[PDB]
Design an enzyme around this catalytic site. Structure first.
Site, PDB file in Angstrom:
ATOM      1  N   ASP A 108       0.856  -1.190   0.000  1.00  0.00           N
ATOM      2  CA  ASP A 108       0.000   0.000   0.000  1.00  0.00           C
ATOM      3  C   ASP A 108       0.894   1.242   0.000  1.00  0.00           C
ATOM      4  O   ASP A 108       0.859   2.055   0.928  1.00  0.00           O
ATOM      5  CB  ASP A 108      -0.885  -0.043   1.253  1.00  0.00           C
ATOM      6  CG  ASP A 108      -1.997   1.036   1.263  1.00  0.00           C
ATOM      7  OD1 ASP A 108      -2.092   1.846   0.318  1.00  0.00           O
ATOM      8  OD2 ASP A 108      -2.773   1.064   2.238  1.00  0.00           O
TER       9      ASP A 108
ATOM     10  N   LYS B  29       0.957   3.843  -2.194  1.00  0.00           N
ATOM     11  CA  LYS B  29       0.327   5.097  -2.614  1.00  0.00           C
ATOM     12  C   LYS B  29       1.288   5.962  -3.407  1.00  0.00           C
ATOM     13  O   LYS B  29       1.519   7.135  -3.073  1.00  0.00           O
ATOM     14  CB  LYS B  29      -0.262   5.869  -1.402  1.00  0.00           C
ATOM     15  CG  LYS B  29      -1.318   5.080  -0.686  1.00  0.00           C
ATOM     16  CD  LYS B  29      -2.004   5.828   0.409  1.00  0.00           C
ATOM     17  CE  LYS B  29      -3.364   5.198   0.718  1.00  0.00           C
ATOM     18  NZ  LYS B  29      -3.194   3.905   1.413  1.00  0.00           N
TER      19      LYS B  29
ATOM     20  N   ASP C 263       3.680  10.676  -7.334  1.00  0.00           N
ATOM     21  CA  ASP C 263       4.690  11.605  -7.820  1.00  0.00           C
ATOM     22  C   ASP C 263       4.695  11.480  -9.347  1.00  0.00           C
ATOM     23  O   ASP C 263       3.936  10.689  -9.940  1.00  0.00           O
ATOM     24  CB  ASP C 263       6.073  11.263  -7.213  1.00  0.00           C
ATOM     25  CG  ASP C 263       6.990  12.510  -6.982  1.00  0.00           C
ATOM     26  OD1 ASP C 263       6.956  13.496  -7.775  1.00  0.00           O
ATOM     27  OD2 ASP C 263       7.751  12.476  -5.981  1.00  0.00           O
TER      28      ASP C 263
HETATM   29  O1  LIG Z   1      -8.740   5.386   1.788  1.00  0.00           O
HETATM   30  C1  LIG Z   1      -7.951   4.645   2.419  1.00  0.00           C
HETATM   31  C2  LIG Z   1      -6.825   4.095   1.806  1.00  0.00           C
HETATM   32  C3  LIG Z   1      -5.993   3.257   2.546  1.00  0.00           C
HETATM   33  N1  LIG Z   1      -6.251   2.997   3.849  1.00  0.00           N
HETATM   34  C4  LIG Z   1      -5.391   2.087   4.625  1.00  0.00           C
HETATM   35  O2  LIG Z   1      -6.151   0.927   5.011  1.00  0.00           O
HETATM   36  C5  LIG Z   1      -5.827   0.538   6.353  1.00  0.00           C
HETATM   37  C6  LIG Z   1      -7.011   0.787   7.283  1.00  0.00           C
HETATM   38  O3  LIG Z   1      -6.708   0.234   8.541  1.00  0.00           O
HETATM   39  P1  LIG Z   1      -7.745   0.249   9.755  1.00  0.00           P
HETATM   40  O4  LIG Z   1      -8.307   1.651   9.852  1.00  0.00           O
HETATM   41  O5  LIG Z   1      -8.753  -0.833   9.401  1.00  0.00           O
HETATM   42  O6  LIG Z   1      -6.848  -0.114  10.924  1.00  0.00           O
HETATM   43  C7  LIG Z   1      -4.613   1.371   6.748  1.00  0.00           C
HETATM   44  O7  LIG Z   1      -3.414   0.600   6.463  1.00  0.00           O
HETATM   45  C8  LIG Z   1      -4.745   2.625   5.909  1.00  0.00           C
HETATM   46  O8  LIG Z   1      -3.455   3.174   5.682  1.00  0.00           O
HETATM   47  C9  LIG Z   1      -7.408   3.562   4.425  1.00  0.00           C
HETATM   48  O9  LIG Z   1      -7.674   3.324   5.608  1.00  0.00           O
HETATM   49  N2  LIG Z   1      -8.199   4.363   3.706  1.00  0.00           N
HETATM   50  O1  LIG Z   2       4.512  18.347  -8.642  1.00  0.00           O
HETATM   51  C1  LIG Z   2       5.643  17.861  -8.385  1.00  0.00           C
HETATM   52  C2  LIG Z   2       5.997  17.443  -7.090  1.00  0.00           C
HETATM   53  C3  LIG Z   2       7.282  16.930  -6.849  1.00  0.00           C
HETATM   54  N1  LIG Z   2       8.159  16.816  -7.869  1.00  0.00           N
HETATM   55  C4  LIG Z   2       9.518  16.306  -7.632  1.00  0.00           C
HETATM   56  O2  LIG Z   2      10.485  17.341  -7.940  1.00  0.00           O
HETATM   57  C5  LIG Z   2      11.583  16.816  -8.657  1.00  0.00           C
HETATM   58  C6  LIG Z   2      11.615  17.357 -10.086  1.00  0.00           C
HETATM   59  O3  LIG Z   2      12.852  16.920 -10.648  1.00  0.00           O
HETATM   60  P1  LIG Z   2      13.369  17.254 -12.148  1.00  0.00           P
HETATM   61  O4  LIG Z   2      12.160  17.048 -13.062  1.00  0.00           O
HETATM   62  O5  LIG Z   2      13.746  18.721 -12.040  1.00  0.00           O
HETATM   63  O6  LIG Z   2      14.469  16.258 -12.342  1.00  0.00           O
HETATM   64  C7  LIG Z   2      11.394  15.304  -8.606  1.00  0.00           C
HETATM   65  O7  LIG Z   2      12.059  14.741  -7.454  1.00  0.00           O
HETATM   66  C8  LIG Z   2       9.909  15.095  -8.450  1.00  0.00           C
HETATM   67  O8  LIG Z   2       9.647  13.892  -7.740  1.00  0.00           O
HETATM   68  C9  LIG Z   2       7.760  17.256  -9.153  1.00  0.00           C
HETATM   69  O9  LIG Z   2       8.524  17.175 -10.119  1.00  0.00           O
HETATM   70  N2  LIG Z   2       6.530  17.757  -9.370  1.00  0.00           N
END
Ligand SMILES: O=c1ccn([C@@H]2O[C@H](COP(=O)(O)O)[C@@H](O)[C@H]2O)c(=O)[nH]1
Ligand SMILES: O=c1ccn([C@@H]2O[C@H](COP(=O)(O)O)[C@@H](O)[C@H]2O)c(=O)[nH]1
EC number: 2.4.2.10
Lengths: 256, 262
Positions: free
Chosen positions: B95, B97, B100
């Protein structure tokens, strides 16, 4: 009229982390954040040492480091103290409050123990900030909320962006600013940091879009440029860093 | 919500012509084991993770990891987990997520200490960055025959993953259907039966926590809202008798599924 960084550092309601940053920005004449997007610890510490004097901030992705250890981060802190820059872990916390609190404090990275700044996506609601705050407030840390993104097809627009700003204003004890493409808040105590910057406009193969320092600082009103590949892929990294620093700094001066 | 008639069983969906091989494998395991429970193994120690996997594996179709909270992560722990996943028949979902730009997420999926791509059957991504996030992941994941879930809705109070954001998630999934196998959502967000729907924010009684989590029942999310799988953390892992808790969740979620048939 447009306040200088030194002036903003002294605002009544300014955050101590924000104040510190703005002071060293004014003092060093840099509003450049290096995106230290490398896979080896040695490269990270080399960049931090060689380019530290040119930057106000070093942005890390520790989850990309093949040989991360906490001793590497302690060494980075030494360099940050020597050269006077903040460490920003671009972790993009983006889960429920209960989960992000553990991700920020614990695991192998122990992010809260070394990062001055982290960031969060606002998509989960304000619980994301509430969870991080429980860990970061006692440790005198700051947080940036992702209000806009630089990539093609970004959904961080309109009401989403407005929600980012509202969340930031409602947690001003912890949130010190934004990742954004432009000034999104009118409150001068908030910082605006902008990724998607190269000297010339362009993009990459995977949705990144680039605009100039002049465009993002001058015309769009942001404070700091975040530059990765424009520096780290250059034949001469210090020369590149100084070019970006000069471009971004002159563009800031032009706003005054 | 309106649902067309003649609801398909998990086994039937596994046979659909355009089903993704990972979705097909998951659907067959669900049908075979009579479980649509995903355990959220939100623990700090590898010992706890592997003990959960071993004790609860027979009750679950999937184990969801947050390896970045594992104090003593190593790739050897992941090898041990994969063996338990084969022995007890469940998928492994990290998980992470991803959220970027594409160039960055590709490295986060493949690289660093976690090497997520080398062990996770499933990962997930937020769609906020635009489709480049999926394109970057796909370059790593498609050669490795992996699957991806897109976060179309969230369970937490104040979630912005609603309306047009949810609709954009579904479109992105369709644009990358060689890799995306479904959604993290609170309800059925697509009528296309090839997509899986996984729902966190589930406890036996409705409720919440003090940091924005909201809980709905398995009957509500599976039976009424049309989701496929319940994701349960604290409802099982905070209990005194975890095997009994897991079985209770399994029963509730499975009976709710049966209630939507035929
Ligand atoms: O919208 C979301 C997306 C992911 N999780 C994840 O699902 C699990 C929920 O755990 P619990 O609240 O049942 O302990 C956690 O690992 C949390 O990070 C959510 O709860 N809601
Ligand atoms: O909206 C966003 C948020 C974060 N970054 C981060 O900023 C850096 C941009 O790098 P570069 O494209 O200048 O190499 C990367 O680490 C990227 O993960 C973005 O580019 N755009």
């Amino acid at each position: 009229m447009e306040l200088s960084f030194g002036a903003r550092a002294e605002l009544p309601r300014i955050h101590p982390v924000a104040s510190k940053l703005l002071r060293l920005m004014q003092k060093k004449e840099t509003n450049l954040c290096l995106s230290a997007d490398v896979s080896l610890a040695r490269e990270l510490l080399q960049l931090a040492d060689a380019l530290g004097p040119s930057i106000c901030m070093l942005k890390t992705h520790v989850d990309i480091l093949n040989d991360f250890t906490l001793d590497v981060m302690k060494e980075l802190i030494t360099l940050a103290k020597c050269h006077e820059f903040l460490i920003f872990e671009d972790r993009k916390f983006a889960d429920i409050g209960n989960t992000v609190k553990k991700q920020y404090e614990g695991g192998i990275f122990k992010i809260a123990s070394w990062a001055d700044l982290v960031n969060a996506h606002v998509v989960p609601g304000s619980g994301v900030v509430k969870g991080l705050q429980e860990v970061g407030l006692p440790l005198h840390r700051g947080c940036l909320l992702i209000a806009e993104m630089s990539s093609t097809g970004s959904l961080a627009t309109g009401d989403y962006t407005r929600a980012a700003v509202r969340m930031a204003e409602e947690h001003s004890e912890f949130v010190v600013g934004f990742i954004s493409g432009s000034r999104v808040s009118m409150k001068p105590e908030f910082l605006h940091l902008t990724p998607g910057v190269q000297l010339e406009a362009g993009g990459d193969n995977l949705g990144q879009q680039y605009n100039s320092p002049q465009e993002v600082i001058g015309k769009r009103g942001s404070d700091i440029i975040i530059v990765g590949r424009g520096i780290i892929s250059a034949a001469d990294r210090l020369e590149a860093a100084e070019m970006y620093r000069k471009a971004a700094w002159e563009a800031y001066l032009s706003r005054l």
